Structure formats: structure tokens, C-alpha cells
Amino acid sequence: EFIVVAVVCALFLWHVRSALVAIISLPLGLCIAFIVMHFQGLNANIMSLG
Amino acid sequence: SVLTVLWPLNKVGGEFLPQINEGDLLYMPSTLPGISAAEAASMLQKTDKL
Amino acid sequence: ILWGTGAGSEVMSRIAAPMIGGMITAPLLSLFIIPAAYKLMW
Amino acid sequence: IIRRSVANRFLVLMGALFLSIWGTWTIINTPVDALPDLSDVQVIIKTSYPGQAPQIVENQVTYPLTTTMLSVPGAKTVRGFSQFGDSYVYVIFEDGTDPYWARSRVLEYLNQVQGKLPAGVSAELGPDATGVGWIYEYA
Amino acid sequence: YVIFEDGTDPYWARSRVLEYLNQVQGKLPAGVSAELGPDATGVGWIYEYALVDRSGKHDLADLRSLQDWFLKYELKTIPDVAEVASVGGVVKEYQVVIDPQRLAQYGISLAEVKSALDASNQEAGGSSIELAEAEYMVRASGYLQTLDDFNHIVLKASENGVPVYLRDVAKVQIGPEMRRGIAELNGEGEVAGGVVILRSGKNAREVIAAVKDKLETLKSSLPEGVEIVTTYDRSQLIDRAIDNLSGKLLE
Amino acid sequence: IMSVPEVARVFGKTGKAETATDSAPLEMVETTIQLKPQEQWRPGMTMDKII
Amino acid sequence: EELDNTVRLPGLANLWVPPIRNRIDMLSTGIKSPIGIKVSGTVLADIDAMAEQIEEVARTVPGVASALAERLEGGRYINVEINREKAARYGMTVADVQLFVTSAVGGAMVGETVEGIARYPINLRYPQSWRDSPQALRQLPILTPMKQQITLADVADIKVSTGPSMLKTENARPTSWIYIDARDRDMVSVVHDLQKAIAEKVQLKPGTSVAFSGQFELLERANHKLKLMVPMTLMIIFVLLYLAFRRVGEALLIISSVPFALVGGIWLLWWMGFHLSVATGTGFIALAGVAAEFGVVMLMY
Amino acid sequence: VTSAVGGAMVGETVEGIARYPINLRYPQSWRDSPQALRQLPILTPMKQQI
Numbered sequence: 001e002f003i004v005v006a007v008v009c010a011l012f013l014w015h016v017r018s019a020l021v022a023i024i025s026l027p028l029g030l031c032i033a034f035i036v037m038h039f040q041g042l043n044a045n046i047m048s049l050g
Numbered sequence: 051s052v053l054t055v056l057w058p059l060n061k062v063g064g065e066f067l068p069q070i071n072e073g074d075l076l077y078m079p080s081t082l083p084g085i086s087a088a089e090a091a092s093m094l095q096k097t098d099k100l
Numbered sequence: 101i102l103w104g105t106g107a108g109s110e111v112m113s114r115i116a117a118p119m120i121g122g123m124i125t126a127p128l129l130s131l132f133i134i135p136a137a138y139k140l141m142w
Numbered sequence: 143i144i145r146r147s148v149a150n151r152f153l154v155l156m157g158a159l160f161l162s163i164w165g166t167w168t169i170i171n172t173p174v175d176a177l178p179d180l181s182d183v184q185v186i187i188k189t190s191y192p193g194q195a196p197q198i199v200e201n202q203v204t205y206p207l208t209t210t211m212l213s214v215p216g217a218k219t220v221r222g223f224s225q226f227g228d229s230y231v232y233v234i235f236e237d238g239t240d241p242y243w244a245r246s247r248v249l250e251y252l253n254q255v256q257g258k259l260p261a262g263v264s265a266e267l268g269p270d271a272t273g274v275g276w277i278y279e280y281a
Numbered sequence: 282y283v284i285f286e287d288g289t290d291p292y293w294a295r296s297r298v299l300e301y302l303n304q305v306q307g308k309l310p311a312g313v314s315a316e317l318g319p320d321a322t323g324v325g326w327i328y329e330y331a332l333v334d335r336s337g338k339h340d341l342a343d344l345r346s347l348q349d350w351f352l353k354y355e356l357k358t359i360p361d362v363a364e365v366a367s368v369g370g371v372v373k374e375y376q377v378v379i380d381p382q383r384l385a386q387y388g389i390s391l392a393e394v395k396s397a398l399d400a401s402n403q404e405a406g407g408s409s410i411e412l413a414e415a416e417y418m419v420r421a422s423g424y425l426q427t428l429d430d431f432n433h434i435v436l437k438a439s440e441n442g443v444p445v446y447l448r449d450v451a452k453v454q455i456g457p458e459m460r461r462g463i464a465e466l467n468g469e470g471e472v473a474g475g476v477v478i479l480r481s482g483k484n485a486r487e488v489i490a491a492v493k494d495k496l497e498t499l500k501s502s503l504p505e506g507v508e509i510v511t512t513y514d515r516s517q518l519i520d521r522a523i524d525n526l527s528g529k530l531l532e
Numbered sequence: 533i534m535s536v537p538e539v540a541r542v543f544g545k546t547g548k549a550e551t552a553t554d555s556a557p558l559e560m561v562e563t564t565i566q567l568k569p570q571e572q573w574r575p576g577m578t579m580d581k582i583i
Numbered sequence: 584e585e586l587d588n589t590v591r592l593p594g595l596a597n598l599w600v601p602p603i604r605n606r607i608d609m610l611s612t613g614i615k616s617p618i619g620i621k622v623s624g625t626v627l628a629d630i631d632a633m634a635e636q637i638e639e640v641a642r643t644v645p646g647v648a649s650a651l652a653e654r655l656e657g658g659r660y661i662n663v664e665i666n667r668e669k670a671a672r673y674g675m676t677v678a679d680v681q682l683f684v685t686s687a688v689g690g691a692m693v694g695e696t697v698e699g700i701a702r703y704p705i706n707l708r709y710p711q712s713w714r715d716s717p718q719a720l721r722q723l724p725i726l727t728p729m730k731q732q733i734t735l736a737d738v739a740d741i742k743v744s745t746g747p748s749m750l751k752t753e754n755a756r757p758t759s760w761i762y763i764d765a766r767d768r769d770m771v772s773v774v775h776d777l778q779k780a781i782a783e784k785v786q787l788k789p790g791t792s793v794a795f796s797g798q799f800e801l802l803e804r805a806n807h808k809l810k811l812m813v814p815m816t817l818m819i820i821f822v823l824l825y826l827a828f829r830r831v832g833e834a835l836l837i838i839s840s841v842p843f844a845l846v847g848g849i850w851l852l853w854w855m856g857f858h859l860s861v862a863t864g865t866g867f868i869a870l871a872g873v874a875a876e877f878g879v880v881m882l883m884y
Numbered sequence: 885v886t887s888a889v890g891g892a893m894v895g896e897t898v899e900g901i902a903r904y905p906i907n908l909r910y911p912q913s914w915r916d917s918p919q920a921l922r923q924l925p926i927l928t929p930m931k932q933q934i
């Protein structure tokens with residue numbers, strides 16, 4: 001998803017550290033969600049992952 | 051264009067939520083109240099061969 | 101996610117589809133109905 | 143309002159790697175399961191009789207067991223299966239009641255019941271796992 | 282009564298006390314059961330109601346019974362009601378009265394009577410047997426359920442016999458279990474009813490409302506010439522307090 | 533108590549009543565007295581004048 | 584398909600489920616059947632006899648209501664009714680008659696032997712040969728307190744009879760839960776008319792109450808709570824719609840704007856074959872969120 | 885002094901989800917007064933009547 005995303009961006013920006021921007025942009029957002037579930041417990045069931 | 055969706059929203063195909071796939075399968079029937087313990091261990095071996 | 105599933109994607113589809121179909125539909129919406137609606141709103 | 147964060151681009155990055163080191167360890171160590179616990183919240187009170195019948199398994203044991211239970215706090219339903227041999231009673235609480243608190247409460251009136259049932263009968267507090275709990279089956 | 286400092290988690294509380302209750306069960310006699318109090322505080326008593334009969338048709342003993350197994354069960358279902366206390370009435374009691382001359386004549390000791398009594402009101406089974414393909418469960422009669430049945434109990438039995446029947450040493454009649462609490466309504470007379478109790482800290486108003494909705498529904502299933510008179514309804518003071526102050530503030 | 537024209541319903545409990553709260557012998561007479569609303573039935577006569 | 588077709592046998596209706604969901608399935612003491620009527624009763628006779636009244640009524644009250652009072656009763660039993668009078672003449676405590684019905688006939692374990700951290704049980708019974716059939720059982724040899732040698736038939740009448748395979752109960756009282764249900768229609772309208780209908784011409788026996796359950800109890804809380812949430816969610820939304828540019832004209836327009844997008848979205852479902860579940864609703868939510876974003880950023884332009 | 889004089893219950897009979905108690909005592913007449921009670925009839929292990 002990230003590379004395809006990045007590939008598409010590259011084409012619409014004729015390449016760029018967009019991928020780098022992507023690793024910052026979404027992985028951290030994923031990370032905060034991973035933290036928050038832990039706060040209120042919950043299980044990493046398929047949907048939480050889904 | 052919205053009318054075109056109202057058609058689908060009123061009919062909405064059918065069925066709700068998903069029945070998820072797990073790599074294995076559980077077989078459970080509607081079985082009849084009374085049977086021999088002998089017949090049970092039998093009508094299970096056969097079932098485990100079919 | 102829509103044309104393949106090793107394990108546990110029967111669910112994602114249901115939530116995914118609305119995006120694609122709605123996303124061929126949502127941008128188009130934006131292209132056209134910000135102006136028409138703004139000049140009509142005044 | 144955003145600009146107050148650019149006078150220190152280092153901050154958000156160092157902040158960011160706070161998230162990096164922290165990120166990697168919270169996400170990885172945590173429990174992974176397929177599906178969510180969702181039987182409900184309950185205590186599985188099983189009783190065991192070697193051989194008998196439903197009239198007698200209910201009359202003899204699950205009557206003593208369901209009836210004392212109506213009175214325990216949090217009880218929504220005191221419904222149970224009674225049958226040839228065994229008598230399972232299921233007790234239900236509202237969602238999200240602390241599960242351990244839960245089972246502790248139900249236990250309250252279990253002691254009152256032990257003396258009222260026969261010798262061959264032992265009233266057993268369910269396991270700790272939910273129905274989902276069954277993992278590794280081996281033969 | 283066991284007491285803790287203020288504000289100890291009430292449920293934690295009762296849980297701790299319970300700890301040593303199990304140690305005690307085996308040390309007291311059979312007739313004795315140690316009971317953990319209800320969940321509500323003394324304040325808890327909310328909706329008091331009485332169970333009267335409009336006529337004579339329905340028996341005093343029959344009412345306590347009506348309130349005990351049918352009602353108390355209907356009203357313990359409502360969300361926040363802890364336990365529903367039964368008051369008054371008469372407890373139907375199967376009563377075997379021995380006669381000192383009859384005992385002497387047959388030489389059957391009291392111990393002899395008690396031993397058979399305990400020994401003739403039980404029901405049991407014995408596995409299944411593979412007749413046909415299905416296995417049939419094996420059971421056997423044994424419960425009491427006929428006064429005549431109480432009579433035909435055996436005590437002194439003999440071969441090429443004749444035997445002594447309990448009917449030969451006692452008169453078995455249904456009676457009124459020694460009373461330990463008597464509920465009454467006016468001159469209307471002795472009448473059994475039940476008190477409702479509110480599991481600590483839960484909107485009394487709401488619980489009662491639920492109860493009043495249950496009783497309206499039940500009167501449908503009630504017998505002939507009997508009704509549920511409310512003897513007391515905490516709810517009203519709840520109301521009277523609210524209306525009074527709600528009106529004040531506007532003013 | 534019923535004679536009193538102010539009182540509405542009355543309930544007589546002379547003992548304990550199937551709750552682990554009520555710890556009352558049979559001499560312990562505890563009657564709940566429902567009092568009729570106050571448009572009925574009297575002038576003067578206050579809660580304390582009633583007692 | 585292949586499997587369900589492969590394994591066919593009598594009395595066996597085949598159901599196939601995945602592990603997790605199945606094991607979950609047996610504990611949750613739930614009544615799947617959208618609707619279901621719990622009929623509480625003091626004695627079994629009342630509730631069951633009444634339970635059949637509900638088979639006919641569910642069928643008549645408009646709705647494909649499949650009604651089954653009880654699939655339960657299906658056990659086969661041997662009834663040893665002990666004749667107290669005929670046992671008395673032999674001075675036998677019914678308890679002792681039973682001793683032959685319990686330890687001898689069946690075989691309740693009478694103790695367990697230790698072999699260190701191990702404990703196997705000890706069974707004490709009459710041979711197979713005297714338990715083979717009701718007849719074999721009518722001649723059960725009972726040795727009286729007076730060494731009077733006899734057969735079980737002398738002390739009791741052993742018949743055969745069908746009975747309860749299992750007993751379910753709601754709160755110490757025996758209640759039969761009928762499973763009545765139509766599909767894909769919110770059966771909220773089907774319940775009330777039915778409940779009054781039964782009340783008008785079919786009567787309940789004294790010492791009995793009736794209640795409904797299943798899914799029906801569910802929606803009324805969910806649906807109702809959802810419906811409330813659409814005002815709540817919209818009111819908090821409008822406030823946050825005209826906050827960037829100040830005026831409500833745009834907030835009006837966003838609301839007009841989203842449904843179109845949803846439209847193009849749902850239409851995809853037909854294309855691929857996907858059905859609408861809460862999962863599609865969640866999808867839809869994502870769609871509405873993304874379009875609202877552009878509305879805002881695009882309005883500024 | 886217990887079962888005969890007073891009347892401790894010696895068992896309860898079932899009538900389904902119901903349970904009424906069984907009382908076993910000497911008649912009223914032999915419990916009327918201390919005197920009535922001084923003549924309580926006790927039948928000894930040796931059929932000695934007293």
C-alpha cells in the first residue's frame with residue numbers, strides 16, 4: 001500500500017521523498033492507535049487490525 | 051443520479067455481517083436425543099472416515 | 101484487499117467498497133458542485 | 143497556531159523518535175488474537191452427577207444451584223442446562239463488569255449451596271477462559 | 282454484624298468477610314445455614330406491598346405460598362432490586378403427630394420413626410440400558426406427594442406378615458408452620474405480603490416504577506378475589522421532594 | 533391507629549420478615565403507617581399534632 | 584458443499600462452522616431466533632400445554648413465524664414407580680429398594696483407589712445379564728431385610744415412557760423458550776399485535792407469566808440509540824462545519840454534498856457482489872469523512 | 885425434648901420449585917404445661933416406659 005501510494009505520488013510530483021513523508025505520515029498514526037488500545041486494554045482481534 | 055442509489059438502498063442485495071473464514075472446520079449437526087454410547091463411538095468413526 | 105484474501109478479508113471488503121465506488125464519485129462531486137452550489141447559494 | 147512548532151523542528155523529531163522506540167515495543171510485545179472475546183460476561187457453574195435424569199438432576203442439584211443464585215448481585219439471568227449426568231448453570235452480567243470481580247460475586251452464595259447437595263455432587267466454578275479460549279487441541 | 286471504616290469499597294468489604302465463612306460452615310449443625318446479608322442497606326427498603334384476598338376463597342397459608350414462589354420470583358428479576366422479602370402468612374407444613382400410647386404398644390422408638398421418615402422421600406436413577414438402539418434412562422419413584430402416602434410409611438415390618446404403618450402411630454395433617462413473623466393489614470386481618478429492597482445506591486424511583494409496571498401485568502395472572510395492595514411506596518416522598526424544590530427555583 | 537381519620541393505609545409487622553435486614557423478635561411490632569394526602573381531611577392538626 | 588453432500592445420514596442435519604465462532608456459540612446461552620417467547624411457569628404441565636397454543640398463534644399472526652413449543656421432550660425412560668404398600672409388606676425403606684435401582688441396576692461408584700497422584704474409581708453393580716432389558720429388569724433380584732428373596736416387580740411397577748431429553752430454566756423457575764422468527768424484516772411491529780391478540784382470546788393459567796426475547800430486545804436499544812445519535816452527531820457536526828469560514832451556507836452544502844458520494848460508493852457493492860453490513864456502514868463513514876475533508880479545503884480555494 | 889416436645893422439622897417435601905417442611909411432635913396435650921411436661925412419656929431402649 002505504501003509503495004503503491006508512494007509510486008502514485010511520485011508520478012503526480014515527478015518523484016520526491018514522498019515515501020519518506022509516507023513513513024512519517026502513516027506509520028506514526030498507526031503507532032498512536034496501537035498505544036491507545038493498550039490504554040483501554042482491548043484485544044488485537046482481526047478487526048482492530050482490520 | 052441519487053435515485054439510481056435509492057433503488058439499491060431499498061433492495062440492498064441481502065445478508066448482513068460476514069461469516070469469517072478460519073483455516074479449519076467444525077462439524078455440528080442437529081442430532082437426536084437418545085443413542086447408545088456404542089453407536090455413538092461408531093457413528094463417529096465412520097463420520098471421521100467419510 | 102478486494103481481489104485476494106489469505107485469511108480474514110471478508111470483512112475489509114464490506115468496509116472498503118464504499119470507498120472506491122464513493123471515491124470515483126466523491127472527487128467528481130468536488131470538481132463540480134463547490135462552485136455551482138456556491139454561486140447558487142448567493 | 144501551528145508555527146509554534148517550527149521554531150524547534152528538532153523537538154517534534156526527538157518527540158517523534160520517542161514514538162519510534164516506544165512505538166516498536168508497545169505494538170510488538172502485545173497480545174495477538176483472531177476475533178474478539180464476545181460470548182459475553184458470565185460464570186459457568188458446572189455440577190457433576192455420574193448418571194441420573196433431568197427430573198432428578200434439576201430437582202436434586204441445579205435447583206439448589208439456580209435458586210440460591212437469583213439473589214447474588216449483578217445477576218441478569220440465572221438460566222442453565224440440566225441433563226442426564228450434569229447440570230450447567232450460566233450466570234450473566236452487564237457488559238464490561240470486571241470479569242474477576244464478576245466471578246467473585248457469584249461465588250458468594252456457592253458456599254451456601256455445597257451442604258445442600260449430595261456427596262457425589264461437586265459444584266464447579268467454570269474455567270477462566272471464554273468460549274473463544276480453546277486454542278491448542280492435540281491428540 | 283461486621284463493621285469497616287467509612288468508604289471501604291462495599292463489595293470488596295463483603296468479599297473479605299466471606300473469607301472465613303467457609304471455615305465455619307462445617308462447624309455448625311445441619312439445620313443451620315449462615316447467610317450473607319442482602320446487598321441493600323437498611324435504607325434499602327422501598328416498595329412494601331401486601332397480598333390480600335377479596336373474599337374468603339383463597340387461604341391464608343395459600344397466600345404466603347403465592348407470594349413466595351410465584352411472586353418473589355417475578356419481582357427479583359427487575360434490574361436493581363436486591364432481594365424481595367416475604368412477610369407474614371402461614372407456611373404450609375406437613376405435620377406428623379406421634380401418639381405416646383401407639384409408640385409404646387409397638388415398641389418403635391422415636392429414633393425409629395425419624396430414621397424411616399428421612400428414608401422415604403428420595404428419588405434416584407441408575408444409568409441407561411441399551412434396549413432397542415436408543416438408550417433408555419432408568420429412574421424410580423420416591424418423592425412424597427400424598428397424605429395417604431405419608432401414612433403408608435413402614436416401620437415395624439415382619440415376614441409372613443403384616444407391618445406397621447406410620448398411620449398406625451401418628452396422625453398426619455397439614456398444619457401452619459410455627460410463625461416467626463406476622464404480617465397484617467388494618468382489621469382487614471392477617472395477610473402475607475412482600476417487601477422490596479434496593480441493592481445499595483440505585484435510583485429508587487426507577488426501580489419502583491419498574492415494580493409498579495410488573496404488578497399491573499401480574500394482576501392478570503392473579504387468582505380470584507385477591508389483589509396486590511401497596512402498603513408503602515418510597516417513591517412518593519421522592520416525588521414530593523422533587524416537585525417542591527423544582528417549583529421553588531423557578532419562583 | 534385506623535380510627536385516626538388522617539391515616540390512610542396501615543401495615544402490621546410483628547417480627548422479622550424474610551430479609552437478613554429485619555432482625556426483629558415477635559414482640560417487635562413494626563407497623564408502616566401510610567398517611568392520607570393533606571387536602572384531606574383536617575384544619576390545624578399538624579404532623580406533630582398527629583403524633 | 585462437497586462435504587455437506589458427502590456426509591449424509593439419518594436424523595443428522597449437517598451444520599458447518601469455523602472453530603472460533605463455533606466454540607463461542609455453545610456457551611452464550613442465547614436465543615438466535617430473532618424473536619423468542621420465554622413462558623415462565625411454576626409447573627411443567629402449564630407451560631408446555633400453553634407452549635403449543637403459541638405454535639398455532641405464531642402461524643396465524645401474519646408473518647412466516649415458525650413456532651416450536653419444544654423440540655426437547657424426546658428422551659426415552661424406564662419408570663420404576665415404587666409401590667410403598669407392596670414394599671412395606673416387606674419392610675423395605677424406599678431408600679433400600681432404590682439401592683437396587685442405583686448401585687445394582689446402574690452402578691454408582693462407591694469409592695476411588697489411590698495409586699499416588701492418581702485416583703481411579705470403583706464400580707459396584709449387578710452383572711450385564713440382569714440389566715439387559717426392562718424384562719431382565721422386572722426380575723431384578725432383591726434380597727429383603729427378612730432374607731425374603733424377590734424381584735423388583737414385586738416391589739414396584741416398571742413401565743416405559745418418553746420424557747424430557749433436557750430441561751432449560753430461567754431463574755429457578757421452569758420456562759419454555761419458543762423459537763419464533765421471520766427474516767430480514769425488523770419484527771418490531773409483529774410483536775405488539777401478537778401480544779395483544781394472545782391476550783384477547785387465549786388465556787394463561789394462574790401461576791404463570793410470559794415474556795419475549797431474542798434479537799427483538801436488541802434493536803430497540805441499538806436502533807433507537809443510533810437514531811438519537813444522528814441528531815447528536817449532526818448537531819456537533821454543523822458547529823464544526825462553519826468554523827473555518829464562519830458561515831452556515833457552506834455547512835448546509837456539505838450535508839447536501841456527502842450523500843451523492845455515498846451513492847457512487849454503495850453502487851460499487853453491486854459490481855463486486857458485496858452485501859451491506861455494519862462493515863459497509865463503517866466504510867460509508869470513512870467515505871463521508873474523506874469527502875468532508877475536501878469540501879472544506881476546496882471551499883477555501 | 886427436641887422432636888417430641890418442641891418439633892424440629894425432619895425434612896421438606898417437594899412440589900416442584902416449591903418446598904414445604906415436615907414437623908414431627910407429640911400432640912398439643914403433652915406439651916401444654918410444665919406438668920404436662922413432667923409426665924412426658926419416654927420409651928427407653930429397654931421398652932421401659934417412663
Ligand SMILES: [Cu+]
Nearest residue numbers: 556560561562
Ligand atoms: Cu424494630
Ligand SMILES: [Cu+]
Nearest residue numbers: 429433446668
Ligand atoms: Cu391400603
